[PDB]
Design an enzyme around this catalytic site. Structure first.
Site, PDB file in Angstrom:
ATOM      1  CG  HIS A 135      -1.715  -1.151   1.261  1.00  0.00           C
ATOM      2  ND1 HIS A 135      -2.611  -1.405   0.287  1.00  0.00           N
ATOM      3  CD2 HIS A 135      -2.180  -2.144   2.185  1.00  0.00           C
ATOM      4  CE1 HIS A 135      -3.463  -2.598   0.459  1.00  0.00           C
ATOM      5  NE2 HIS A 135      -2.916  -3.092   1.766  1.00  0.00           N
ATOM      6  CE  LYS A 178      -4.679  -7.471  -1.865  1.00  0.00           C
ATOM      7  NZ  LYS A 178      -3.518  -6.722  -0.781  1.00  0.00           N
ATOM      8  CB  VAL A 184      -9.917  -4.261  -4.368  1.00  0.00           C
ATOM      9  CG1 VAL A 184     -10.048  -2.862  -4.199  1.00  0.00           C
ATOM     10  CG2 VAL A 184     -11.278  -4.876  -5.151  1.00  0.00           C
ATOM     11  CG  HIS A 242      -6.394  -4.540   7.101  1.00  0.00           C
ATOM     12  ND1 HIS A 242      -6.945  -5.235   5.856  1.00  0.00           N
ATOM     13  CD2 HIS A 242      -7.434  -4.093   7.527  1.00  0.00           C
ATOM     14  CE1 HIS A 242      -8.291  -5.023   5.759  1.00  0.00           C
ATOM     15  NE2 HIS A 242      -8.405  -4.513   6.802  1.00  0.00           N
ATOM     16  CG  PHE A 243      -5.860   0.438   2.448  1.00  0.00           C
ATOM     17  CD1 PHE A 243      -5.204   1.709   2.562  1.00  0.00           C
ATOM     18  CD2 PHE A 243      -7.038   0.311   2.089  1.00  0.00           C
ATOM     19  CE1 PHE A 243      -5.822   2.889   2.188  1.00  0.00           C
ATOM     20  CE2 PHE A 243      -7.622   1.608   1.512  1.00  0.00           C
ATOM     21  CZ  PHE A 243      -7.094   2.551   1.856  1.00  0.00           C
ATOM     22  CG  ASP A 244     -11.091  -1.959   7.144  1.00  0.00           C
ATOM     23  OD1 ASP A 244     -11.098  -3.302   6.752  1.00  0.00           O
ATOM     24  OD2 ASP A 244     -12.005  -1.660   7.554  1.00  0.00           O
TER      25      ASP A 244
END
Ligand SMILES: O=c1ccn([C@@H]2O[C@H](CO)[C@@H](OP(=O)(O)O)[C@@H]2O)c(=O)[nH]1
Length: 124
Positions: A12, A41, A43, A119-121
């Protein structure tokens, strides 16, 4: 191996460009960061800000994560990001993505000591 924090940076972070210019950004970046080697992957979001700025989000607005956990944080300021979404004609290994640039608040999950993004939520 690879730490959860390291993976977040690999998946990210992209402080090199101010914004994703040209619709080919994702096709190249997703492959470059090894996000299409086992499969495509679906998204993935890249954040165009300094690492310190993104890490600082772990001390900002505490909000619920999409999975129900309570360790998510929303940035107070909007940030330059690029969303990468796999197209329909996309077929592994030739993964194809639609590149979307925008300025939005990011939401990341943080954990560990030091408390960092893992983690990118979401983006809002
Ligand atoms: O806006 C969005 C939505 C989803 N994802 C990505 O899709 C992933 C798979 O569950 C996750 O990666 P990650 O958990 O390794 O950060 C993230 O929620 C993004 O990167 N951006």
């Amino acid at each position: 191996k690879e730490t959860a924090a390291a993976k977040f940076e690999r998946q990210h972070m992209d402080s090199s460009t101010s914004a994703a210019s040209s619709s080919n950004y994702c096709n190249q970046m997703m492959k470059s960061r090894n996000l299409t080697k086992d499969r495509c992957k679906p998204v993935n979001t890249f954040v165009h800000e300094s690492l310190a700025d993104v890490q600082a989000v772990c001390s900002q607005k505490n909000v619920a994560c999409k999975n129900g956990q309570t360790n998510c944080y929303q940035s107070y300021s909007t940030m330059s990001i690029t969303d990468c979404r796999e197209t329909g004609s996309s077929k592994y290994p030739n993964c194809a993505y639609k590149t979307t640039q925008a300025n939005k608040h990011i939401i990341v999950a943080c954990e560990g000591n030091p408390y960092v993004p893992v983690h990118f939520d979401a983006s809002v």
